[PDB]
Design a protein around this ligand. Structure first.
Ligand SMILES: [Cl-]
Ligand SMILES: [Cl-]
Ligand SMILES: [Cl-]
Ligand SMILES: [Cl-]
Lengths: 131, 131, 131, 131, 131, 131, 131, 131, 131, 131
């Protein structure tokens, strides 16, 4: 067995290829996945896994230099919006319209679908560099 | 969005094709997956999701006429062994040696990998019929 | 066997991947399917299955936020036009020219071909969200 | 549009390649499909389409020299058993154990899944020759 | 064996998918086939099968609402030009320059190659509808 | 255009790879094609192309060192049986049971389907060598 | 074995599909092949096979309507330039800049690589017709 | 970028899928790779990377339960043989004939090729479990 | 075994297809790889193999006519920048901004990832010709 | 361009993957190629390239430890048989019956077809090692 790194085999393969500026998306149960973008669905039932838990695991296994979310999150989902600010304190958090957000996901290397059933619980993590 | 059935998109596709006697495997984080068998990895981190959580969701979305597990589960993993007995109290449960169990996984339509970090936490659910 | 959801295995896989705003098409026996769009043919013979029967099953298994149809349906197929208006009384129904309608089908995730032998008996169902 | 022959596009492609002695299967909603055999699912909901309707259409579009069915059908589904005997009065009808029947399906060119929710409502149609 | 419809297995598969306005091309032995367009070659030797033989079989198995040919056919291949006029006397026949004709073949579902060794012996059959 | 050789593009590709002892099959409209064996269908309608015409074209484009046919051809189809004896005078003509014949076709590089509607009009041409 | 036509199996397949105006390229050992264009490498060692030997064989097996080469060939490779002029006496020979020549290779059906180790020994053969 | 685990993207993907008892091979530059087994070539030039450097990295990123090498390594490559014995002090080390060793490589998930230019510098690492 | 040329099997395949002006990229551990471009990862651990070691092997096995690197390498990675100048003293070295450099990698035949952990340690080698 | 090694890009890729004992076949224009074995056709016309020229290039670019040929070559093709003996005087040359020889080609990594038009002009080169 693999001693270190993220436990999920699908995610490990994606993290392995990340280069500077590559993007991955963490999504709620409703976000549409653009054609041609790999979809890794971890959901089991509503609320499992949760957006926060998934985002937390990724934060410690991936070097993030920038986080992108939809402005709508601050109003429609304040609890998860704070979680992000708190989790990625040192990182730059950029907000956009949910529409612009969806356009950006077309460039993602993958969309990770969680079991999150709350509005606008989605974010794009932009890979940083280790040196 | 799909209104009914299992939430996971990969899993729904597998359940959709199940016919009478088809088998799927729920596995712990260490079970090897035979070549040619589709692997759906739901693991996030050790213990998440758990064998019990996964097995419960599947029992709720699939008609199971028989369950198969390794005999070593009773002696080395009593908690989960009893969980299976209780969950599938109405189905026929059969115990084979772990070696025979693995040979049987070769005929499975898929192996669902959980984040379970306890010994012999694996089972084969054999589909029943709705009429 | 799968306990809940749509019975058709091909359709179940399509519904499983639906995200907010994704579109699917229910079509009569004559509608052309754009290159690159998945085609699921349920027809058996003229009139089986009917547009009405197919649309009814989908409405029950999928969350629809909007329905799109060709204005021409109100002129050459009033029967199905009324059925559509009745079935989706709660949803927003928009009529476009048949030409525009066909253009929009290029973005559908799939076209479901029925055995319906009446003119303009086609519609686009746009997926809603469960939360 | 195609003027003659079976309306279903998937089925037309299968019938087109049929040579003397090739086999196709008409099945109820529960029959398992062997790995490697093409599966065409026409089901819409329980009972639609019915075994009888599907078998009738195929008999009209394909030259059948022999029909194979499981002996169990005469016991648990007399209605469909009679229909079969009547529909193919001119053809040779052989009954085998359901176990043997399933084995023979491994050599079929395709399995056509209907919405039939009654036991052992399955049959193998062996193609004849037109000259 | 298939009882009704066109005898050629490759062709039956193509006709099976035709929807209103879809196009197929019948070509002489020299027409170039655009990249991405399926080529079905029925030629055996020069003149076998002939353009006329092929076009007649297709007219009998497909509903054609419009025919398209190169204007150069009238001047350089009168026999076949008149044949088309007579065969499709009830359909709308449109003449474009051979250069425009070739550009149009890019949107065809397939090109059927005949053994015809006479100039501009090509045409596009545009599928009509059965209701 | 290709100046020399067989006109059919599909057949030319097959002949190009022939080595000493490779086999190709010429078949009537009813012969079943084994799984995994390439099928090139030249049929247009019943009787076109004919078995004799196809066999004749192949004879002049391919070096044949042996012909294999089903014994049944001599009784059930004497006219085509004579054609073969006459066409491949210098070649060795071996006869087998139609059943053994069908088994042998599994090794063929391709099956060429003609529009021949007469019994046992099938043969296997075994490639010879040019030096 | 195949009796007539080019001996090389790869090339035979390419020639077989040629339609009027299709292009193939004969290249020296250094010409870059555009992505998407099939490459058939015949080189064994420097000078084997020569551009002249390869061009001569293709001229005998393919109907050439027009030849295209880079102007630079007249300056740095007069020997092969004269050869080309003489081999294709009856055909039109167009000279373009090497840069434009390379752009046109992107439309070629194939690039045939030779062992030629002399500058600008490349040419495009545009297929003609046999009627 | 990925924070933890092996740095090589290809290897990370291989380790990610490892289950208990799965095997990977570390090989010298001459070991043949069985058909069907994925090959990951890390060699740059003779001696880079060394068998020792590669084996050391894998030992730190993978849970090794058992090591298998060819007996011949003790005779012709004592240096690397001692290395292996010391690196895997706690693991079981089985020596088989080189011929048997090669047969076992057919079951490996991958063969990692190094730049090692010394005889029998090959070994099979059998995955253990983390619980 | 292959007697001459680069030792790495993956790289040998890429060098084998190089034509005049084709490009390959040598990258540090963080450079992102554009979609569609082949990635050959030779890294083992940080600093192994080094940028200099990789570039040196390539310069000896590939005819280079031009080198391209980011301007930023001169100030942020002086050591490697000097190496680059010395190694390719004969060839033309062009410096672009890193952003412009990355756009150019879109056209590369491959990206060779090294274990280099220093910024802007990337370069494009543009193939020359041997005559 | 690649500076060293065999010039042919197809062959370079095959030599790159050779491991100890791997085999490649050099064949005359008539040797049949087993299904599943890669065929690289270098022939241009009868006698070009010749068996001797091809074998000579390979012997210089590949480390050979053993040569295998049909016994029949000694009596039916004396010239090439002598060449074989002289070229591989150091290596072991084993002679089997042609039928046995052909069975061995099943395991070859590739068959290189030459333009040789003389009987039994085939041989298997079994790869050796460089250390
Ligand atoms: Cl479902
Ligand atoms: Cl049909
Ligand atoms: Cl040919
Ligand atoms: Cl990892």
């Amino acid at each position: 067995m693999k001693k270190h790194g993220i436990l999920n085999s699908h995610l490990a393969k994606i993290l392995a290829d990340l280069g500077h500026t590559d993007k991955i998306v963490i999504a709620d149960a409703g976000l549409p996945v653009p054609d041609g973008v790999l979809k890794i669905d971890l959901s089991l039932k509503p609320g499992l896994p949760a957006f926060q838990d998934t985002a937390a695991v990724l934060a410690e296994e991936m070097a993030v230099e920038k986080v992108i979310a939809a402005a709508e999150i601050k109003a429609s989902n304040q609890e998860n919006a704070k979680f992000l600010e708190n989790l990625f304190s040192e990182q730059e958090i950029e907000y956009l319209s949910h529409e612009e957000f969806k356009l950006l996901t077309k460039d993602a290397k993958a969309v990770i679908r969680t079991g999150e059933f709350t509005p606008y619980a989605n974010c794009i993590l932009q890979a940083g560099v280790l040196f």
